């Protein structure tokens, strides 16, 4: 049997691609999906051991969401350590395991993982969520402490809202646990102090939430000279990841103490759009990496974002935290991910629909003009530079773009609105969501898209990070378009591996 190879390079016709069950760069196990990442830095192995919850499409009704461990060292390569902590019985309090934290004790050479057990169909007198602990001697085998049950209602907190234990050790030598719970109708991040991680004292309330919202997966850390609190908003209308800044821990606590609204920056602490959730950070001592999950779309439709809140779990995504001189935080591509792309692919124009002109590597586009490039591959890195006429232009990058493509999915960088918008173009012209960022004063944009199969992350001049789930984007042409202003694109480079 002689195999036939189609002319992939030379055609711009839309092609029905498919996603493999496994992912390499943005990790996804061959079985199940990643949810709620729990990063951790191993002081012994000097690597990153990120755990998560193994979600499935047909989740069992009672017991589900086990914990699976993933070892990495750079954020690009990932190996799987298998199931670490298994879900309990139907009647056990830990039938479903929620997000947790991990901390190493040199005192007894033990890894302690504090997770949240969810009672299946809890009764009136039964706490819905209880914090539990599992100990490991070598991070491989885990034994759950059956004598530890940190009930939320013991300290006057809500029974049904007691989640996300985050553990951190300060310089004074005492470990602090933050729990995102509810008190008398108000969202409170409560602090528990310990000296041996076996007995805890509730040291009041660490912080209060902003405008009766809920914070998911709190993460307090220190980056040089500021204290940062990364959290995920549980509100259906927001469903995003924000952060708070503070020179000291006291200043961070005083931030939003009572409807203060001390936003860290002018974009209300935005980091990424709707396609990034449960962002939790870990540092190896030289760099800080945040892990989250890009959600999947029901029916494999990029425009089917879904009502209220999107689908749970998805692909593990790792980004690098960048701290500016003013204390603001921005997300950047990991160095290993950037350097993994080695081979370079020649790029050439496919379609000439607009009034654009070509002068070599430079393409000048007016309003209503667009240019279509050649096909992409499974893993793509598209880097280019766009100079706009002024600070009120609307250019855009469109994927799943073909000669006969009825609809394509676009990211429009609107300088007049000062943000970017992920929308669906074509016969539907549907608006999906957006993300605010800082507009450069020189009208210069350095656009770098890193795409693995169907998950793509766009970086704009180290100021905007935009995660997207775009199915069928691999092995399909991509295009640049302009709608209102005048743009000039250059240095277009496509790298694959």
Partner 1 sequence: TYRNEILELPETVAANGKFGGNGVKSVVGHTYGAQVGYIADGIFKSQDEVDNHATQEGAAVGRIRYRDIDHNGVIDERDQNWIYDPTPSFSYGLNIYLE
Partner 2 sequence: SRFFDLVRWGEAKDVINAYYVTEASRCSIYKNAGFTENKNEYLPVPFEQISASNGNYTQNFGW
Partner 3 sequence: MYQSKMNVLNTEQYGRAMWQAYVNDGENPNGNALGYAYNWGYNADGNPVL
Ligand X SMILES: OC[C@H]1O[C@@](CO)(OC[C@H]2O[C@@](CO)(OC[C@H]3O[C@@](CO)(OC[C@H]4O[C@@](CO)(OC[C@H]5O[C@](O)(CO)[C@@H](O)[C@@H]5O)[C@@H](O)[C@@H]4O)[C@@H](O)[C@@H]3O)[C@@H](O)[C@@H]2O)[C@@H](O)[C@@H]1O
Point out the residue whose Cβ comes nearest to ligand X.
98
Which one, of 308, 300, 302, 310, lies nearest residue 426 by Cα?
Answer: 302
Residue (47 or 311) nearer to partner 2, CB: 311
The answer to whether residue 58 forms part of the interface with partner 2 (CB under 8 A) is yes
Q: Are 62 and 51 in contact (CB under 8 A)?
A: no
Would you state the structure tokens that stand for residue 399, as one six-digit string? Answer: 């994927």
Residues marked as binding?
A: 21, 379
Q: Where are the alpha helices (DSSP H) in 5-116?
A: none
Q: Are 187 and 209 in contact (CB under 8 A)?
A: yes
CA atoms within 13 Å, Cβ hemisphere of 488: 10
The answer to whether residue 18 forms part of the interface with partner 1 (CB under 8 A) is yes
Residues marked as binding for Zn(2+)?
A: 21, 379
For residue 357, what are the contacts with CB-CB under 8 A and spacing of at least 6? 363, 364
The answer to whether residue 154 forms part of the interface with partner 1 (CB under 8 A) is no
For residue 299, what are the contacts with CB-CB under 8 A and spacing of at least 6? none
Q: Which of residues 168-227 bind partner 2 (CB under 8 A)?
A: none
Q: What is the DSSP letter of 46?
A: T
Q: Which of residues 81-140 bind partner 3 (CB under 8 A)?
A: 81-83
**Where do contacts with ligand X occur on this chain (CB under 6 A)?**
36, 55, 59, 65, 96, 98-99, 118, 160-161, 163, 216-217, 234, 278, 309, 312
Q: Are 262 and 348 in contact (CB under 8 A)?
A: no
Residue 304 site contact among partner 2, partner 1, partner 3, none (CB < 5 to 8 Å, cut-off depends on kind): partner 2
Q: Where are the alpha helices (DSSP H) in 248-320?
A: 249-254
List 8, 9, 18, 22, residue binding partner 3 (CB under 8 A)? 22
The answer to whether residue 301 forms part of the interface with partner 2 (CB under 8 A) is yes
Residue 348 site contact among partner 3, ligand X, partner 1, none (CB < 5 to 8 Å, cut-off depends on kind): none
Q: What angle do CA 372, 378, 384 make, to 5 degrees?
A: 45
Which one, of 478, 454, 477, 461, lies nearest residue 24 by Cα?
Answer: 454
Least CB distance to ligand X at residue 182 (A): 8
Q: Cα separation of 79 and 63, whole Å?
A: 26
Which one, of 269, 209, 211, 206, lies nearest residue 241 by Cα?
Answer: 269
List 11, 17, 24, 193, residue binding partner 3 (CB under 8 A)? 24
List 5, 236, 258, 286, residue binding partner 1 (CB under 8 A)? 5
Residue 299 site contact among partner 2, ligand X, partner 3, none (CB < 5 to 8 Å, cut-off depends on kind): partner 2
Q: What is the bridge-based pairing of β-strands 409-414 and 226-233?
A: unpaired
Residue 1 site contact among partner 1, ligand X, partner 2, none (CB < 5 to 8 Å, cut-off depends on kind): partner 1
41 to 70: interface string for partner 3, x by CB under 8 A: -------------x-x-x-x----------
Residue (63 or 407) nearer to partner 3, CB: 63
Q: Is the dihedral of CA 274, 279, 284, 285 positive or negative?
A: positive
Residue (22 or 156) nearer to partner 1, CB: 22
Residue (42 or 311) nearer to partner 2, CB: 311
Q: What angle do CA 295, 298, 299 make, to 5 degrees?
A: 135
The answer to whether residue 475 forms part of the interface with partner 1 (CB under 8 A) is yes
Phi, psi of 140 (to 5 degrees): -90, -60
In the block, residue with structure tokens 């809920």: 214
H or E stretch covering 89: none
Q: Which of residues 352-411 bind partner 1 (CB under 8 A)?
A: 378
List 10, 13, 20, 143, residue binding partner 1 (CB under 8 A)? 20
Give bridge partners of residue 494 from the DSSP assignment. Answer: 345, 382
Residue 55 site contact among partner 1, partner 3, ligand X, none (CB < 5 to 8 Å, cut-off depends on kind): ligand X
Phi, psi of 222 (to 5 degrees): -125, 130
Residue 81 site contact among ligand X, partner 2, partner 3, none (CB < 5 to 8 Å, cut-off depends on kind): partner 3
Q: What is the bridge-based pairing of β-strands 143-144 and 175-183?
A: unpaired
List 44, 298, 344, 406, residue binding partner 2 (CB under 8 A)? 298
Residue 278 site contact among partner 1, partner 2, ligand X, none (CB < 5 to 8 Å, cut-off depends on kind): ligand X
List 82, 185, 224, 299, residue binding partner 2 (CB under 8 A)? 299
Residue 80 site contact among partner 2, partner 3, partner 1, none (CB < 5 to 8 Å, cut-off depends on kind): partner 3
Residue 438 site contact among partner 2, partner 1, ligand X, none (CB < 5 to 8 Å, cut-off depends on kind): none
Q: Are 358 and 451 in contact (CB under 8 A)?
A: no
- The radius of gyration of the chain from alpha carbons, rounded to an integer in Å, stands at 24
379 Cα distance to chain centroid: 19
Residue (134 or 178) nearer to partner 3, CB: 134
CB-CB neighbours of 328 under 10 Å: 18
Residue (293 or 363) nearer to partner 3, CB: 293
- Footprint of partner 3 (CB under 8 A): 21-22, 24, 29-32, 54, 56, 58, 60, 79-83
Site for partner 1, rule CB under 8 A: 1, 3-6, 15-18, 20, 378, 475
- Binding site residues, partner 2, CB under 8 A: 57-58, 298-299, 301, 304, 311
């Amino acid at each position: 049997p002689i195999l036939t190879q189609k002319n992939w390079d030379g055609t711009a016709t839309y092609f029905q691609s498919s996603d493999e069950h496994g992912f390499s760069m943005y990790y996804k196990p061959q079985v199940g999906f990643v949810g709620a990442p729990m990063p951790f830095y191993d002081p012994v192995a000097k690597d990153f051991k990120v755990m998560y919850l193994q979600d499935y499409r047909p989740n069992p009704e009672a017991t589900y969401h086990p914990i699976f461990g993933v070892a990495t060292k750079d954020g690009a390569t990932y190996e799987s350590l298998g199931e670490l902590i298994s879900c309990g019985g139907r009647d056990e309090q830990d039938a479903a395991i929620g997000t947790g934290g991990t901390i190493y004790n040199p005192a007894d050479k033990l890894y302690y993982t504090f997770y949240t057990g969810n009672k299946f169909k809890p009764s009136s007198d039964q706490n819905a969520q209880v914090v539990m602990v599992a100990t490991s001697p070598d991070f491989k085998t885990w034994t759950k402490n059956r004598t530890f049950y940190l009930k939320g209602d013991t300290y006057g907190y809500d029974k049904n809202d007691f989640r996300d234990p985050f553990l951190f050790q300060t310089e004074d030598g005492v470990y602090h646990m933050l729990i995102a719970t509810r008190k008398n109708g108000k969202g409170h991040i409560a602090e528990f102090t310990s000296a041996d991680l076996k007995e805890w004292e509730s040291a009041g309330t660490f912080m209060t939430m902003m405008w009766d919202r809920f914070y998911e997966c709190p993460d307090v850390f220190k980056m040089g000279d500021w204290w940062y609190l990364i959290y995920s908003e549980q509100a259906s209308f927001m469903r995003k990841v924000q952060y708070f800044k503070g020179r000291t821990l006291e200043d961070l606590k005083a931030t939003t103490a009572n409807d203060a609204g001390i936003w860290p920056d002018n974009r209300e602490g935005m980091l990424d759009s709707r396609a990034f959730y449960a962002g939790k950070t870990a540092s190896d001592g030289t760099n800080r990496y945040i892990w989250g999950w890009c959600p999947t779309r029901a029916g494999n439709d990029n425009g089917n974002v879904g009502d209220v809140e999107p689908e749970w779990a998805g692909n593990l995504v790792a980004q690098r935290l960048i701290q500016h001189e003013d204390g603001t935080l921005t997300l950047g591509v990991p160095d290993a991910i950037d350097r993994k792309y080695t081979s370079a692919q020649e790029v050439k124009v496919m379609a000439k629909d607009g009034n654009m002109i070509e002068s070599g590597k430079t393409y000048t586009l007016g309003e209503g003009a667009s240019v279509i490039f050649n096909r992409l591959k499974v893993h793509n890195k598209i880097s280019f530079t766009v100079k706009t006429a002024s600070n009120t232009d609307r250019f855009g990058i469109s994927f799943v773009r073909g000669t006969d493509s009825a609809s394509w999915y676009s990211i429009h960088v609107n300088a007049d609105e000062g943000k970017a918008n992920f929308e669906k173009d074509g016969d539907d012209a549907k608006y999906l969501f957006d993300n605010k960022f800082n507009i450069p004063a020189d009208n210069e944009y350095r656009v770098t898209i890193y795409s693995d199969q169907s998950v793509c992350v766009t970086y704009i001049n180290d100021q905007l990070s935009f995660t997207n789930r775009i199915y069928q984007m691999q092995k399909n042409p991509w295009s640049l378009c302009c709608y209102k202003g005048e743009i000039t694109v250059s240095d277009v480079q496509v790298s694959t591996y």
